[PDB]
Symmetry: D3
Subunit: 245 residues, 6 copies
Amino acid sequence: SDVFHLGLTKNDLQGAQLAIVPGDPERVEKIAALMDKPVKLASHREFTSWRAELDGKAVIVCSTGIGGPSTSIAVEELAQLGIRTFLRIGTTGAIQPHINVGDVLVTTASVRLDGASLHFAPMEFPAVADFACTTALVEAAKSIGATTHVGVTASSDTFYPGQERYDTYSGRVVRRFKGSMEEWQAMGVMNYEMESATLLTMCASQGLRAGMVAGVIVNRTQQEIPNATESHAVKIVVEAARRLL
Amino acid sequence: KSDVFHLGLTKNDLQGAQLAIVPGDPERVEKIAALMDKPVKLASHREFTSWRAELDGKAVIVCSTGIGGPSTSIAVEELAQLGIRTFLRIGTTGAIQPHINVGDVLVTTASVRLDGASLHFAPMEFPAVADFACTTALVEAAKSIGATTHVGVTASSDTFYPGQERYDTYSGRVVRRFKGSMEEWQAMGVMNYEMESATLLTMCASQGLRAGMVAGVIVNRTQQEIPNAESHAVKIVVEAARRLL
Amino acid sequence: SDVFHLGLTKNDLQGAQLAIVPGDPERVEKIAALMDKPVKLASHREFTSWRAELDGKAVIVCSTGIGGPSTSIAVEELAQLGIRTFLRIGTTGAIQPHINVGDVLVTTASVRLDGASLHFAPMEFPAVADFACTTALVEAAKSIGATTHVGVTASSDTFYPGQERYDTYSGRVVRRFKGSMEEWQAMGVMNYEMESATLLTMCASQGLRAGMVAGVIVNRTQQEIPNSHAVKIVVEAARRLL
Amino acid sequence: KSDVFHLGLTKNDLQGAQLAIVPGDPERVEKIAALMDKPVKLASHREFTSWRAELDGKAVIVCSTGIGGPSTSIAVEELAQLGIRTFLRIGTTGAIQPHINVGDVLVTTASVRLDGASLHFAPMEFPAVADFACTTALVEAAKSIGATTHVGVTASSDTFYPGQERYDTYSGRVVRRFKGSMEEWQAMGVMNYEMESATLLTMCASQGLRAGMVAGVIVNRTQQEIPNAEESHAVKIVVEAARRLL
Amino acid sequence: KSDVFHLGLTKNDLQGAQLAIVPGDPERVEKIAALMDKPVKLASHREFTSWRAELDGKAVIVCSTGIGGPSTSIAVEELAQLGIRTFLRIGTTGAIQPHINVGDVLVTTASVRLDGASLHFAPMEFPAVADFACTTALVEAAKSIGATTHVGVTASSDTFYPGQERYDTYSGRVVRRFKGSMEEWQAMGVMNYEMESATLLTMCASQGLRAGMVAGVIVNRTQQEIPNAKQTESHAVKIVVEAARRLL
Amino acid sequence: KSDVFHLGLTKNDLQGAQLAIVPGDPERVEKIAALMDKPVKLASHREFTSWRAELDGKAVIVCSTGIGGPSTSIAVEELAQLGIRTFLRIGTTGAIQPHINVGDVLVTTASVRLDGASLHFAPMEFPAVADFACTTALVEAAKSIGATTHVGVTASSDTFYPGQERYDTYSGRVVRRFKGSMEEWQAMGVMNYEMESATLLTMCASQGLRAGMVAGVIVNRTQQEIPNESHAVKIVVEAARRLL
Ligand SMILES: O=c1[nH]cc(F)c(=O)[nH]1
Ligand SMILES: O=c1[nH]cc(F)c(=O)[nH]1
Ligand SMILES: O=c1[nH]cc(F)c(=O)[nH]1
Ligand SMILES: O=c1[nH]cc(F)c(=O)[nH]1
Ligand SMILES: O=c1[nH]cc(F)c(=O)[nH]1
Ligand SMILES: O=c1[nH]cc(F)c(=O)[nH]1
Ligand SMILES: [K+]
Ligand SMILES: [K+]
Ligand SMILES: [K+]
């Protein structure tokens, strides 16, 4: 195929230039199933991809897996195939008391607690979302009347210590991360996730457009682990996609 | 003699103002306040000249910051003590992309942190990112007046010379860190250089203050190092201030 | 389910204390089928987990996906469930001229060109493999007869720029990693992969045992993109560690 | 019609000047100049106000820098393009050692680099160290007039608030890096805080220029955070030190 | 006179030796050399005292490095210029784990880089890892001698005092970076403190030289700061000599 | 017995001494002490040879530090515990400026911190700066004897080879950080390279102790890589008299 990990060819994209990139492979089909003419493209490792049509235009929906490293592979390979706009949709844990489960978060930029971002730009470069993409996400949110918050997100290379979880095997957190939640909290950070800094950084420094939207599944001021609906963040990412085609 | 050590202002002076406009040049403070209703000179200490004015019935502050993040940080901190919650910076800048022309207006989504003052509010991992309401209000203001606008990332440097990789200087040398840097910022899509935005955006975004950033291009570095001897920016910032009140 | 991502209970493990952790979830069944009574436990996201028996004890085979981040999840949730020893098996790109495709590499310690490792120990801490696991892997390779190389591995958060590939959309590599492959080469580094730094660091810093073995699928002194002995080795090493 | 972009000055304006005295406050420039012979205003742009004067026959410049290392780097760079080789900074400062009183004079031998601009001239490992000749001139001037003097290390901060660990602020918080920091600089024997020295000293030491630094104490941080409302030994000392550095 | 600037040795002096044992203390060089055949004193300049001996028909060098990465880096480099390819460090150490006793033997797999010299050879991301053959020979040597042995990670510090979080000092102060650090290394499973291995291991691992590190514990930090002037064992010495047989 | 773990000295051995001259070479200690009154050998353990002597009726210590910051930090700490408050370092150095000649004397105002030990006393932002009274003494002493002197910044390196960008070495490689660095220090007016000043200067300046540093130039790196006098010794002893 045309790309090493994804197993896709330029032919599979049929002219698509926008991709919606969830973290979970099993969500790919459900997102594509909201659009016209969904067709499965390929399934390798953590990269599941579908093609669909939105207003007569081809759109790609491809999973990135968990974390910057695999995310960077999806974005890079999708870029080689002609994608220029990436809309990530994920799940997220909120760290502000006024943000509720079910709420929708739109990320203007990300605190860079990852490692892959640095493979694209030095630390001082901002992991900032594209203005057109963020606008579109914001305006989509309003059109469906979702409770939406816009601002900064913390993007961690780990789910546990980097998000200062203590309910773990070691029950311990390295110095850099000890007390860090309350720090990000005092600094207005809205939430924690694991892909945004890689996605936003590599795209802002390579001429690609990226936006990030997330559904709040747990509030960290209350508990550490989410319980066993996200549909809002999905309807919003598809509707923003339309405005960007 | 007042409520704040450097600005020489009292809370009574602001008369309930909650948004300030912050130029670099003390001289330009009067020119900007005069574009609004009931301009009243308040104080002038060191490089901190401040006027009060009125915009659609509500009090607004205009206050110069001087050159660079340290005096900018003084002025934002003291104005915030006096009740200011939204700051809009208007400035001049050197463009580093060929397609950007002298006279064009740049709106900054976020900045590369090539300064030190920002580090005094948030660690380097934190994004020097503009508020989304301010950025939107600038962009929509620039459209209302029909100015050539570019929206993106700005390199924000603690120096005018080596930090912007100028070689026509006394030493004629540039420290390793910055040698080759302008070409790198160019490849990453950075639009321009200036000296106050990293400090401004970081301190605001990490403390719950809203901040935007707009600038007029006075030189293009692809052509020359030093700008020529010589209004869009000012109109836009006043107009955005109106939309934000 | 007692853990958030893996969908596993302690009951599923039947007392297992050792896991073999490959990157590719489609490789978990093959590895498991080399052992006895292979059973499919769970499969969520990139985490596909099988249980089998070896040396008359329960063993876990569980995929981590690509990169430190999803690796740190698997290792932490398996640890919570009883796993004390982790045997990494992956694929890798060699950067030394004398290392051919089909060779087997055992990592003693890794260059930390990753981020997740810092969520466990500051950069000064070595990303070093456990000495028992490393021995068990090297002796297993001397018995299988494979061509083996032992040493330092460069563990990257990216497949492309971090490994100094230029045939990419941007064709660009950030200042940090520009010229970096020849640097590692000159420092004796054997190969590139993407998970070892995180695994080694989080394990060596929390009283867990880990080791790492990989089969070479490309040699970078020849090309950027690549056109079963490591599997037998990793299974035999686990046999010894039980 | 100038030779430099910010200061609005020509090399002819300096009339052979090779030593500059550099206060922070534009308004203090005339007053310092008048303490010497032939005081004449040169230019005034933004925070850079510049007067020429004469000291024992030799032309001298007095030029403000504004607050902070960024505007200091500019003024120093453009002055050096116009011929200045020696820079004497005169400022105000907040002491953090108990035995140092308001009204005392401080001569900096080197600064803690808590700024950003110094890094545009040298990496962190390089010392923001003052020139030995300037430092000697300042010390011997202070002793000649019998001013209470302290000689040693200064912490130079890119901010007035969080960097000098002030909590009486809008946010009321200080970032991890600076939390507990004032107590540390105290234990380390640091005399005081100010905002320009690290940049000035680093850029001059690494570019073959001579720099000296003397400051008046206007508040003691063991007593209070903000200096009160309100002899002149510091300014007297810098002009006296300049006579020896000519 | 000589071929190298500090050691005062010529290639001829080494008699074709390829392996060196490198203790810290000059006064220990003779003792270790005396354990082998035909001990001969080569040179003694500054803190570099070097003997040559014969182990199993092969020439071997014993050379003291002094305290710290800097002088260690000098010895190793000049010994390398003279043909030495394998380096075995033997020293004393202070344990930070409760279960490690005075007189116990420690074999370092890799080290925490709390030094400066290693950065002159390799960026911090690079592991200060011992050679796998050297480590193996040392562990097997320890088995044969029946020594109480622990294998693991060592913290290698540029100072004796603040870097190893000692407070009974002139200042009684430890800078923020090292404050609370001992207990952090303890929780990360680090066995001990010493002052040379990070530099030794790193400059060797990154320049195609083999190195291994063994040390005898002379104090336990969970008990006291300064070692008593005892349960001391010269096992380490025996271990390194026997390991040298395996590496020859 | 001993009060200090490495030096093997008790406070009784110092007899009130509060100043020490500290060379790198153990072998040099006796020759330096023999320039003063009533020289007596105190102890010699590993690389720390210590002598006591009198200068104008006052006891002074001469103690070797060995090569590098780590052992220097030991000798300084332990002497400090024994009552030493002022340290005068005398060393040898390689000049990196073409105008500085072999045999010239260098006085260090401050050091570029290319070591590791200095960081165990203060963060990197802190200046490795000499004490002004010691520097004044050294400079006026050098003026007193009539030696060719340069005053300024020194580069203090944790290695002799790569940190000082020497390429004639086993691997003939220099890691990225130090590649091109000598030319950089040269352009920043750095005078010279040695290996102990950053540590001695930072630990003394952050702990209320006085330190000065003077060095004799034995090689000029613009001319050659490896070196192939006595003025710095005169100066550090003469300066010792002024600090007493
Ligand atoms: O990285 C995260 N993803 C989802 C979550 F709910 C969370 O808390 N953290
Ligand atoms: O900081 C800057 N301000 C204005 C300019 F024109 C420029 O190039 N740089
Ligand atoms: O991380 C990597 N995995 C597989 C490879 F072939 C390679 O070169 N790098
Ligand atoms: O930067 C400062 N200048 C003057 C002062 F009094 C102070 O405390 N800080
Ligand atoms: O570096 C050290 N060597 C020996 C010891 F006993 C100790 O505690 N630290
Ligand atoms: O550290 C050094 N000491 C002495 C020298 F001659 C030299 O070049 N470098
Ligand atoms: K200013
Ligand atoms: K993954
Ligand atoms: K030594």
